[PDB]
Write a protein that binds this ligand. Structure first.
Ligand SMILES: NC(=O)C1=CN([C@@H]2O[C@H](COP(=O)(O)OP(=O)(O)OC[C@H]3O[C@@H](n4cnc5c(N)ncnc54)[C@H](OP(=O)(O)O)[C@@H]3O)[C@@H](O)[C@H]2O)C=CC1
Length: 179
């Protein structure tokens, strides 16, 4: 089984882990408190500290909020070359001078940041997307990473919508707030 990483242990991380297992992946979780977080996950999930989880995969969902990204800054060297999937949303349209994915890319300039899955609810990861809204919008400045995340979306039974460069991340982040 291919191993996919998730940083965080909240509702989104738990729901993502469900879907990843159901679709045939092995999951490693990086948590600040893995002994505590371990009960929030099945025994088949490897719950560990961030620095250990990162050695077990090259593709990591960053299932934390933007305001906590700098808590990972000391991992910069270990994260070099890894795909970081920015799943985040904000509470306001155009909240910051940069999109959350561009902010994450500025913190980890030698990682490969891909925006994706922010439009998917936790409940949708558990039950599946509605048949008329299976779409997940994906973008990145790195074409190869973008295509890997597009393929992961397909394996998770979503319809990936390729919006090209990371410049698209801002309006992808605005979309849940628009109607
Ligand atoms: N909930 C949802 O339905 C959706 C959420 N999202 C996005 O997913 C991401 C997570 O959302 P959600 O699960 O609801 O968020 P939570 O508020 O549950 O936070 C998630 C994780 O953040 C981690 N973390 C929390 N604080 C810190 C910190 N101070 N430093 C380092 N890590 C920290 C915790 O992991 P730990 O304690 O294990 O370290 C925690 O389990 C967000 O970006 C959100 O916008 C996207 C679509 C839907």
């Amino acid at each position: 089984k291919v191993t996919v990483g998730v940083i965080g242990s909240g509702d989104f991380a738990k729901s993502l882990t469900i879907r990843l297992i159901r679709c045939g992946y092995h999951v490693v979780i990086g948590s600040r408190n893995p002994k505590s977080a371990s009960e929030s996950f099945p025994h088949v999930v490897d719950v560990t500290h961030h620095e250990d989880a990162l050695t077990k995969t090259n593709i990591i969902f960053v299932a934390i909020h933007r305001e906590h990204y700098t808590s990972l800054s000391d991992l910069r060297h270990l994260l070099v070359g890894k795909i970081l999937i920015d799943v985040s949303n904000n509470m306001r349209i155009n909240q910051y001078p940069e999109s959350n994915a561009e902010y994450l890319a500025s913190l980890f300039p030698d990682s490969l940041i891909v925006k994706g899955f922010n439009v998917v609810s936790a409940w949708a990861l558990q039950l599946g997307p509605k048949d008329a809204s299976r779409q997940v919008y994906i973008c990145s400045n790195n074409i190869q990473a973008r295509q890997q995340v597009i393929e992961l979306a397909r394996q998770l039974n979503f319809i990936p919508i390729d919006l090209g460069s990371l410049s698209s991340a801002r309006e992808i982040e605005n979309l849940p707030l628009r109607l």
